[PDB]
Amino acid sequence: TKSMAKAAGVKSVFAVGNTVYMTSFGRGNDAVLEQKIVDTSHEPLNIDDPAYQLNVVTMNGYSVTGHRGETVSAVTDNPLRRFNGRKPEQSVPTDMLCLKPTLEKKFFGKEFDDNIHIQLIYNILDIEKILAVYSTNAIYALNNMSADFFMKRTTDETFDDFEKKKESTNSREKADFDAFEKFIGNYRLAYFADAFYVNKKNPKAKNVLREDKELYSVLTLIGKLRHWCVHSEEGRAEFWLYKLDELKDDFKNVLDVVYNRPVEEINNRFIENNKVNIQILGSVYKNTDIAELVRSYYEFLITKKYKNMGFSIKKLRESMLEGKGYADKEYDSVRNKLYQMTDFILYTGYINEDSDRADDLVNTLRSSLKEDDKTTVYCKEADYLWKKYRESIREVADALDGDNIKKLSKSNIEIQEDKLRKCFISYADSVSEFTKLIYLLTRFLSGKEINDLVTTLINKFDNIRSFLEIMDELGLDRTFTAEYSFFEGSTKYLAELVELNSFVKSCSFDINAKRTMYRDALDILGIENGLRNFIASNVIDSNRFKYLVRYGNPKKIRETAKCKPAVRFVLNEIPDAQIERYYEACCPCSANKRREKLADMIAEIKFENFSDTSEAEIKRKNQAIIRLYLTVMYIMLKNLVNVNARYVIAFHCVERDTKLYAESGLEVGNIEKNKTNLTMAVMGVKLENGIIKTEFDKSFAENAANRYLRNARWYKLILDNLKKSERAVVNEFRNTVCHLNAIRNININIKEIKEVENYFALYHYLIQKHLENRFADKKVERDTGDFISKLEEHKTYCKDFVKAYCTPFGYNLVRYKNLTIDGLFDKNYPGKDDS
RNA sequence: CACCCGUGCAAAAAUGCAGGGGUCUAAAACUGAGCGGAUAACCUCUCUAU
RNA sequence: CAUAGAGAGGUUAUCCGA
Ligand SMILES: [Mg+2]
């Protein structure tokens, strides 16, 4: 169940000096101060419209009782007594990595004797983590077409300086320029059309490649983003993301050109596309002015302002209109627009008059301790919503049902348009460089990744804004240092990101390149009259083909489709009803038997199977097989990439905390030579002649750098794993994770697997096979040899090897546990702890 | 069935009960979002064809 | 500038399994 304190209305508890402050939830992700306690002495802020009242206040915590919605009473622990019980004074808590003073001194001027700034700093760190992961994914997608260049690319040089490599007398950069030249002109550049292709007029319009300057600028921006996020830059370059206004003119121009296209393609046709909707709404909103109504419609549909009010308008409308038989065939043709107008009416009803009703609904939602209440309150609200808006819904339905009158209302243009355009999407000349760079980064990833990245950024920026508002209200110092003053405008950035969330979609395949992708689509199934044209047409339009090609070589995907255990596991993840539907679509008998038959059929898909009695039967069968194959391989590849993202997070965190600990005064040494120097430095052990001679002692655990390694058992376990690791193996693992070499070489690394129990096991088997292949002709330590022999003998990933080469993350115990023991890696598959 | 912290109780150096964690792990609450298919209208540029 | 028929893209629903 969820936290009862959060449901009671307690947002957070902040320790400032010897006093403590308790906040409350507000409109959206806002915070309101109402309670200050100084050693069992309570003073109430927010004298009017309170959120909760504290019953008993003690040094050990505070018991509170809420007033919003359900009167749920809970208890909250005192932050000033953290780490100070049964072992004897009040002190401001520190982060578990013992890096709070260093982070405060870095992002701000000095230490602040409170636990508010550190949360903002950790939100910034989360922003950097997610940016690192998705920039690494984008770089891998851009590099996959090769079937070095993207590592040394920096924005300090423009295309004019890069062009001097034509006559360069040194081969080191001549090879780089040759690689750049080979990059352009590649047919695989047809993907990512919005990043490399632009529309051109006939003197009809066709998509053509941009000039070399713009392509180089895009590549440089992406490469520098990856280099800055993944690595720990030193000097001015470490502020590259937060000083994007200092970029050269070429990069700004390419960012503006990339960003302006969707905006100019969305707000230009807004009036014409939704004409009938505004006409009907004006008919039913007789009193409201037309300009204000169209402004509200634009803010509701294009900007999608109905997805951040706290509740779900869609759920309320669904639970309201279900009673009346609008789901019947009678309104089948008009359902699409009628429902949209219903949600619009609901939205304008909750922002003009029923603001208090919306606040009550969101309060009841927040105070619920389970899922049963979250539906009962929705139904209760929907009853009143029906009883109030039945007439308006009926009027809209009858107006839309008049297809004759609908056509009569479509050919007449009387809308005021050149006035009140301030609601339109801001062009590239008004948005910040950070948002444009984020959009350019998103132009290289799949839609789910885009949604995850944008939502995470919006949430973190909202967190930063709320914390800044809290600090301003409390009177605390919040002036960032001169290098991070960008974050002072964070609120504005949040808006842009929210605005960016309105219209950002996946990338579009170029229309003219529909023939160049014929070979890739025809070869992803490994085929090689005119039936192959049908197969290519039915493969290209699949949404999973984009992911399968942008993130994998089609021939390699076809080769890895022969791994029967892997495909069998992916089919096992699919529920029984879906498997039955697939079998009935692909063929004219238990669930497991049908799953095995499907896994056998997909493994040797051939041209004979497609060719081989109605034309409306064999065509659907071939389509079903094609779509099933594409779905299976897409799921496998996507989950493998998502698993690799976690280790990308881990290595970025390792680099960042290495730099932070080195700044904090800990002798960590260089990290490029050995990636596990953080863990030894935190423990305090040294590589005496290449091995850790020191054994376990309780004193070493008692004097660890951070609270993570202050438990004797986990200290001993991680030290033992360290003594069983190898520097070269760790470096190769880091390179494989950062460059996604395991996923790229999936053809070979999956050849001789026996059984797959989860995606974690498959990914680590791939990595272990890659490590064995790279070290097949090199001298390795006895532990690595034992691990490789065990992997070869069992033909399954070795968990001890995972514990061995994941030791660089050992300084963070929770991350190490999550990334080593299977069953704790994925939150969607909660397993059992093996240790 | 993760990690850390608080409090009661058994102990004697750890078990249990009940909680908290934005300052632990992709990871605070409402919501936005991170799951997969199989059909539907409606708009735009046509492009022979009416 | 009506009906047949293609592509290619916008939003939007509703249906079952989680
Ligand atoms: Mg966090």
Give dist(CA A785, CA A208) in Å, integer.
53
Q: Which nucleotide is nearest to A304 (CA to C1')?
A: B32
Give dist(CA A345, CA A713) in Å, integer.
61
Please say whether the beta carbons of A764 and A806 come within 8 A.
no
Identity (one letter) of the amino acid at A781? E
Q: Distance, CA A526 to ligand 1 centroid (Å)?
A: 45
Give dist(CA A796, CA A762) in Å, integer.
8
Sheet holding A42-44, edge to edge: A10-16, A19-26, A28-37, A42-44
- The beta-strand segments (E) located in A191-350 are 197-200, 206-209
Which residue from A656, A785, A774, A790 is spatially nearest to A726, judged by alpha carbons? A785
The phi and psi torsions of A448 (rounded to 5 degrees) equal -60, -45
Give dist(CA A69, CA A71) in Å, integer.
6
Q: Which residues contact A65 (CB under 8 A, 6 or more apart)?
A: A8, A52, A53, A54, A55, A71, A72, A73
Give dist(CA A257, CA A201) in Å, integer.
16
Q: Distance, CA A3 to ligand 1 centroid (Å)?
A: 17
Please say whether the beta carbons of A22 and A37 come within 8 A.
yes
State, as a whole number of angstroms, the distance between the CA of A294 and the C1' of C8. 29
Q: Distance, CA A126 to ligand 1 centroid (Å)?
A: 7
Please say whether the beta carbons of A150 and A143 come within 8 A.
yes
Burial A486-524 (b: 16+ CB within 10 A, else e): bbeebeebbebbbbbbebbebbebbeebeeebbebbbbb
Which residue from A113, A144, A128 is spatially nearest to A655, judged by alpha carbons? A128
Q: Which residues are A77's β-sheet partners? A: A61
Bases in strand B with any atom closer than 7 Å to a protein CB: 1-8, 19-44
Give dist(CA A557, CA A631) in Å, integer.
12
Q: Which tokens belong to A245?
A: 């206004």
Residue A702 burial (CB count, 10 A): 10
Residue A637 burial (CB count, 10 A): 20
CA atoms within 13 A on the CB side of A713: 1
Strands A206-209 and A10-16: unpaired
Q: Which residues are A63's β-sheet partners? A: A75
DSSP state of A307: G
Q: Which tokens belong to A221?
A: 């921006």
Q: Which residues contact A448 (CB under 8 A, 6 or more apart)?
A: A638
Q: Which residues contact A425 (CB under 8 A, 6 or more apart)?
A: A263, A266, A267, A302, A303, A499, A502, A503
The phi and psi torsions of A336 (rounded to 5 degrees) equal -60, -50
Q: Which tokens belong to A318?
A: 């669904």
Q: CA gyration radius for chain A?
A: 30
- Identify protein residues whose C-beta is within 7 angstroms of any atom in strand C: A 273, 301, 314, 318, 327, 335-337, 339-340, 343, 505-506, 508-509, 511, 514, 537, 540-541, 575-578
Q: Which residues are A54's β-sheet partners? A: A64
* Sequence-ordered alpha helix ranges (H) in A231-289: 249-266, 270-273, 275-284
Resolution in A: 3.0
CA atoms within 13 A on the CB side of A121: 24
Q: Which tokens belong to A791?
A: 């992997």
Residue nearest to nucleotide C8 (CA to C1'): A511
> 């029906």: which residue's tokens?
A386
Give dist(CA A517, CA A145) in Å, integer.
13
Give dist(CA A14, CA A23) in Å, integer.
8
State, as a whole number of angstroms, the distance between the CA of A89 and the C1' of B36. 54
Angle between helices A615-664 and A727-739 (to 10 degrees): 130
Helix (H) or strand (E) holding A53: strand A52-58
Q: Where are the domains of chain A?
A: 4-92, 123-248+428-479+487-503, 270-408, 512-640, 652-820
